[PDB]
Amino acid sequence: CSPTHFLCDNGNCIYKAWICDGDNDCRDMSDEKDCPTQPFHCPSTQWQCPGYSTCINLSALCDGVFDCPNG
Amino acid sequence: YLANDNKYCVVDTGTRCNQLQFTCLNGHCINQDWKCDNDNDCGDGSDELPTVCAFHTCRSTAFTCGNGRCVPYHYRCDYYNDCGDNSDEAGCLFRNCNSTTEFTCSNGRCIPLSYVCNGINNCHDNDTSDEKNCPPHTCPPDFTKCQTTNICVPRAFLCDGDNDCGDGSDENPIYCASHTCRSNEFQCLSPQRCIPSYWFCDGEADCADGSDEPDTCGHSVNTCRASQFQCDNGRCISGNWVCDGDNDCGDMSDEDQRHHCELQNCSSTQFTCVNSRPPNRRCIPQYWVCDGDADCSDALDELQNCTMRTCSAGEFSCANGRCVRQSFRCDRRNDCGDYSDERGCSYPPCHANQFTCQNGRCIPRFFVCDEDNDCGDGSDEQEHLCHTPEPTCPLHQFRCDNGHCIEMGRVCNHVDDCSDNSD
Amino acid sequence: NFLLFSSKTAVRGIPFTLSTQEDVMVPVTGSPSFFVGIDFDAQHSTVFYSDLSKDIIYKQKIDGTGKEVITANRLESVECLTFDWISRNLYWTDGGLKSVTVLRLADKSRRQIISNLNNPRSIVVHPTAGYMFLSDWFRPAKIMRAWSDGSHLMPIVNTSLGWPNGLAIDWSASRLYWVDAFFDKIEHSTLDGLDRKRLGHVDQMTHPFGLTVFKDNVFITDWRLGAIIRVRKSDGGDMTVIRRGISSVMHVKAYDADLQTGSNYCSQTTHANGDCSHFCFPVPNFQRVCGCPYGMKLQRDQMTCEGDPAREPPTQQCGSLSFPCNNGKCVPSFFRCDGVDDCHDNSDEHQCGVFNNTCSPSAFACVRGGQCIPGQWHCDRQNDCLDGSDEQNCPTHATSSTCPSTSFTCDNHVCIPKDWVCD
Amino acid sequence: XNXXX
Ligand SMILES: *[C@@H]1O[C@H](CO)[C@@H](O[C@@H]2O[C@H](CO)[C@@H](O)[C@H](O)[C@H]2NC(C)=O)[C@H](O)[C@H]1NC(C)=O
Ligand SMILES: *[C@@H]1O[C@H](CO)[C@@H](O[C@@H]2O[C@H](CO)[C@@H](O)[C@H](O)[C@H]2NC(C)=O)[C@H](O)[C@H]1NC(C)=O
Ligand SMILES: *[C@@H]1O[C@H](CO)[C@@H](O)[C@H](O)[C@H]1NC(C)=O
Ligand SMILES: *[C@@H]1O[C@H](CO)[C@@H](O)[C@H](O)[C@H]1NC(C)=O
Ligand SMILES: *[C@H]1O[C@H](CO)[C@H](O)[C@H](O)[C@H]1NC(C)=O
Ligand SMILES: *[C@H]1O[C@H](CO)[C@H](O)[C@H](O)[C@H]1NC(C)=O
Ligand SMILES: *[C@H]1O[C@H](CO)[C@H](O)[C@H](O)[C@H]1NC(C)=O
Ligand SMILES: *[C@H]1O[C@H](CO)[C@H](O)[C@H](O)[C@H]1NC(C)=O
Ligand SMILES: [Ca+2]
Ligand SMILES: [Ca+2]
Ligand SMILES: [Ca+2]
Ligand SMILES: [Ca+2]
Numbered sequence A: 001c002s003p004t005h006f007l008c009d010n011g012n013c014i015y016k017a018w019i020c021d022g023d024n025d026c027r028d029m030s031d032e033k034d035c036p037t038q039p040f041h042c043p044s045t046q047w048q049c050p051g052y053s054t055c056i057n058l059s060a061l062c063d064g065v066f067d068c069p070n071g
Numbered sequence B: 001y002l003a004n005d006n007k008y009c010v011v012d013t014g015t016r017c018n019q020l021q022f023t024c025l026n027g028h029c030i031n032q033d034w035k036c037d038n039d040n041d042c043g044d045g046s047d048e049l050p051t052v053c054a055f056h057t058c059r060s061t062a063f064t065c066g067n068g069r070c071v072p073y074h075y076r077c078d079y080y081n082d083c084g085d086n087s088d089e090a091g092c093l094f095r096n097c098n099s100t101t102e103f104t105c106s107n108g109r110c111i112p113l114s115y116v117c118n119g120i121n122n123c124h125d126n127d128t129s130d131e132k133n134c135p136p137h138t139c140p141p142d143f144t145k146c147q148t149t150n151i152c153v154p155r156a157f158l159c160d161g162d163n164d165c166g167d168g169s170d171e172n173p174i175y176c177a178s179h180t181c182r183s184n185e186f187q188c189l190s191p192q193r194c195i196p197s198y199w200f201c202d203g204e205a206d207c208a209d210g211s212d213e214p215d216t217c218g219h220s221v222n223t224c225r226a227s228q229f230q231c232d233n234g235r236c237i238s239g240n241w242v243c244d245g246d247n248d249c250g251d252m253s254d255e256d257q258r259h260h261c262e263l264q265n266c267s268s269t270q271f272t273c274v275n276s277r278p279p280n281r282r283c284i285p286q287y288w289v290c291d292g293d294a295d296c297s298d299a300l301d302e303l304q305n306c307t308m309r310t311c312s313a314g315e316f317s318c319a320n321g322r323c324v325r326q327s328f329r330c331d332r333r334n335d336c337g338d339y340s341d342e343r344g345c346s347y348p349p350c351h352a353n354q355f356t357c358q359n360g361r362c363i364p365r366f367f368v369c370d371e372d373n374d375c376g377d378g379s380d381e382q383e384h385l386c387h388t389p390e391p392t393c394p395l396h397q398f399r400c401d402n403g404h405c406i407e408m409g410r411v412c413n414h415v416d417d418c419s420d421n422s423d
Numbered sequence C: 001n002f003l004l005f006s007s008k009t010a011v012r013g014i015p016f017t018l019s020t021q022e023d024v025m026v027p028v029t030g031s032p033s034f035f036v037g038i039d040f041d042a043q044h045s046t047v048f049y050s051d052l053s054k055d056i057i058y059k060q061k062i063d064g065t066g067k068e069v070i071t072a073n074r075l076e077s078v079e080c081l082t083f084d085w086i087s088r089n090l091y092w093t094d095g096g097l098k099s100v101t102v103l104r105l106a107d108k109s110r111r112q113i114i115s116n117l118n119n120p121r122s123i124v125v126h127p128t129a130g131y132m133f134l135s136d137w138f139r140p141a142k143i144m145r146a147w148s149d150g151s152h153l154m155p156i157v158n159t160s161l162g163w164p165n166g167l168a169i170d171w172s173a174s175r176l177y178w179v180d181a182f183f184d185k186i187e188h189s190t191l192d193g194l195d196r197k198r199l200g201h202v203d204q205m206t207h208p209f210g211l212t213v214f215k216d217n218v219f220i221t222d223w224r225l226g227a228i229i230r231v232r233k234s235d236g237g238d239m240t241v242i243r244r245g246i247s248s249v250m251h252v253k254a255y256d257a258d259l260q261t262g263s264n265y266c267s268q269t270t271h272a273n274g275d276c277s278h279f280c281f282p283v284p285n286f287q288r289v290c291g292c293p294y295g296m297k298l299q300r301d302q303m304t305c306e307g308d309p310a311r312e313p314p315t316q317q318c319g320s321l322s323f324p325c326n327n328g329k330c331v332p333s334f335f336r337c338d339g340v341d342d343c344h345d346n347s348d349e350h351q352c353g354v355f356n357n358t359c360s361p362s363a364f365a366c367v368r369g370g371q372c373i374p375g376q377w378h379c380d381r382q383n384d385c386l387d388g389s390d391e392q393n394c395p396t397h398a399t400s401s402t403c404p405s406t407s408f409t410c411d412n413h414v415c416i417p418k419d420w421v422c423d
Numbered sequence D: 001x002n003x004x005x
């Protein structure tokens, strides 16, 4: 199989963007059999105050009261 | 070593449990399905210790009690509290027994009224009130009276591990717990149990772990009794059959002149057919004298005091005076006494598998080389066909002292090839 | 007993005895119709069906009364059904979601128990043994087996298969039977996949789909014949055509009230449902495992069930671009108030034509009383609107528009070839 | 082919 592609357990070659896309592109579980990387990070205009688990619209940052429990 | 998913201490005697077995502090591994179910199986309660049963969760297929134990699912609603907490019998909607003809037990069990105090506990209820044993007020000998209910139960089940009486007489602290059984009995170590003195040291295992037979037992297995004859094989027989003319001991120990059979003079009025030889008994009971059966080796018991026989034209007439059918001729058996049947015969040869002896006798092939003169002339015990020459153990094969000769590359290789390092 | 089979146009029930021909059950039919999966509930005289034109699963009495839907939400090409008559669980196979689902009929409770298949087709479940079998026909084709709870998935037949369309079970012998349509064969084996055997060549079988075993006959449906054929279940058999010209033909099934008899620990009496909330599943070797719907997790006791929103969050009936019907179905948001019943409950055509509930751009709106009608009904010479708005002031101008010189022209301005006149 | 039409 070419270095561009993952070699599936059934002998298919599949492009290594589609591995871990969430769908079994190999038709075997091979390209989803080892795909853990999904962190709790918050996208968009939210902010994740460090060491705290909530995510808040960045307009509230320095609004003049601590949104998150401690500084 | 750290047993049981590295959570537990066990003494490191080198041996290990299997993959699916739990380990106890004292060893004696137990299967995982016995873990945390009210049954003590380790002896120390390691399989039921509160620490072990704290994190343990029931297998998907087992009923979980409110207590946290894991009973097999078929125990649920079976009348009988096996959960301890009764949590598997809680909510059970039992059918109402026909009280007009059946008895509804205190545990909800249905049983016929005819079975009330019939002789044995049927309800097994916490109340125990079926087997009151209603009609008699007592139990006679060859049984113990059970204590609060008068069932006839042999003491032989005292302390044995289940309530034979349904009343605790077989578990009474009055006996077995106090002092060691009646004068006619002994106590097993496993289970803790009174048993008869004729089980204790009797030649067999009668407790669960054989503690009734603990190596020191009389003289020997052939200790027998003052009324029983003693056999070299360890068998015990009645003294009445000693030197009666046939093997009773099972090893001929009662049928030899080696110990004593020289004066085997039999009982009372038995006819003594002196024509008989050690292959048969000379003395014959008068019970079957003149009965038409050849008791003696030459059937003299059928002429000595017997009415004459008219015989038949369709039967073989022995020249001596006996009468038999044609089936009793040419068969190596002296049916007529005077060998008139076997005389002048032309026995056809032995079968394909059948072995032939020098005297022409036919014997089964299995009966060759077994230290018994089955051919009569000793053909089946001839050295040439019976002796097995030991292997030559040539070059490439070292004869070590054990006889199991090994490959000559292995000589004093420090690996025990021949029993106690004979190489 | 009777033979139940499905087709594009109807679901029918037929006597096994070919001597008579009349139905025993009312046909099941609709205006749009493409029936595929079927099964029956003998204890309620009820059958189930799917319809790929509506993506609903239905239930209906044999008499025809009491039609109800089971589900209409997230069904995609339901290619087969099977019913666990002891647990009252309905299993189906979404060829479009590529999964198998189970649903309890007592209260609507569903989970995708197997999720990542390729082209699953027939499914069959055996309640007393606690196994379910399903076929997959993607290139590396195979027949799976799993515990009824949807675990221990493993292939039992993966060698010498292509297109293994229909599974069925001989209840009298605990033998699985299956069609294969790439090698044009029918085979059978024990439930373990061992002891595999092949029936002889069947005349004019070319592509079979449905399979059933009842008494000593095997019933099969061939797409290339468009018929139901019968053979003896032990060998090639006497191919006997049961039906012919049956259009697009789908699964067969043997209705039998005697079959739907028995009890696992999942519905023994004195307690209900094997103590599980929501589901219990029979598991091989006479045991039960509890189950929980989507979004719920088994508690520490492994039987009672608790909310689990952390792992499986609650979900909407429909997306943001689709209108959720009163029925569980889902339709495009612009199919609301289009004059056509798309939800199969008239839920999309309810209280239409009012402010906050306007007619679609495609439909024609009656000017008064809030009624939206299909566009095709606008000025077609039928008074559809309650106020007759649809047959008022529309073009009469046929104009100088003419059909080609080849075509004859009617007074209705429809045109047909001159060849068609006076036939 | 073998797909449901
Ligand atoms: C086809 O099915 C067979 C079973 O009939 C599979 O063989 C088993 O393979 C597993 C490992 O995957 C072993 O532990 C078993 O012992 C095998 N046999 C049994 C008794 O099940 C085989 O792996 C399957 N092949 C494919 C391609 O899936
Ligand atoms: C859309 O219009 C209809 C009719 O004007 C509204 O219908 C009422 O809705 C409420 C709440 O669901 C019901 O209790 C009433 O019975 C409905 N009918 C009447 C006659 O009151 C509906 O509320 C409108 N929707 C929106 C979002 O404005
Ligand atoms: C109970 O037994 C009586 C006497 O035989 C009988 O008449 C009656 O029908 C029985 N009832 C039930 C519920 O079993
Ligand atoms: C019934 O059960 C109780 C425990 O709940 C026990 O103490 C009692 O001894 C039992 N009854 C009889 C008759 O033994
Ligand atoms: C006990 O339950 C836990 C979950 O709470 C696990 O499923 C565990 O495997 C179960 N016990 C056993 C022995 O399987
Ligand atoms: C939402 O979808 C999930 C699966 O993604 C479940 O089917 C769940 O039951 C759905 N919720 C509703 C209300 O139908
Ligand atoms: C009113 O509702 C319908 C529902 O099909 C359409 O969305 C329509 O576009 C809406 N409004 C108007 C003014 O057309
Ligand atoms: C009728 O319409 C056709 C198609 O457009 C032609 O235009 C034809 O010439 C028309 N006939 C007349 C008489 O105008
Ligand atoms: Ca992928
Ligand atoms: Ca702030
Ligand atoms: Ca235990
Ligand atoms: Ca119980």
Ligand SMILES: [Ca+2]
Residues within 6 Å of the ligand: B115, B116, B117, B118, B119, B120, B121, B122, B123, B130, B131
């Ligand atoms: Ca009794």
Ligand SMILES: [Ca+2]
Residues within 6 Å of the ligand: B157, B158, B159, B160, B161, B162, B163, B164, B170, B171
């Ligand atoms: Ca006892």
Ligand SMILES: [Ca+2]
Residues within 6 Å of the ligand: B199, B200, B201, B202, B203, B204, B205, B206, B212, B213
């Ligand atoms: Ca003994």
Ligand SMILES: [Ca+2]
Residues within 6 Å of the ligand: B241, B242, B243, B244, B245, B246, B247, B248, B249, B254, B255
């Ligand atoms: Ca003797």
Ligand SMILES: [Ca+2]
Residues within 6 Å of the ligand: B288, B289, B290, B291, B292, B293, B294, B295, B301, B302
């Ligand atoms: Ca005699």
Ligand SMILES: [Ca+2]
Residues within 6 Å of the ligand: B328, B329, B330, B331, B332, B333, B334, B335, B336, B341, B342
């Ligand atoms: Ca003779």
Ligand SMILES: [Ca+2]
Residues within 6 Å of the ligand: B367, B368, B369, B370, B371, B372, B373, B374, B375, B380, B381
């Ligand atoms: Ca011999």
Ligand SMILES: [Ca+2]
Residues within 6 Å of the ligand: B410, B411, B412, B413, B414, B415, B416, B417, B418, B423
């Ligand atoms: Ca050696």
Ligand SMILES: [Ca+2]
Residues within 6 Å of the ligand: C181, C182, C183, C184, C206, C207
């Ligand atoms: Ca074909």
Ligand SMILES: [Ca+2]
Residues within 6 Å of the ligand: C335, C336, C337, C338, C339, C340, C341, C342, C343, C348, C349
């Ligand atoms: Ca619509």
Ligand SMILES: [Ca+2]
Residues within 6 Å of the ligand: C377, C378, C379, C380, C381, C382, C383, C384, C390, C391
């Ligand atoms: Ca109209």
Ligand SMILES: [Ca+2]
Residues within 6 Å of the ligand: C420, C421, C422, C423
């Ligand atoms: Ca015409």
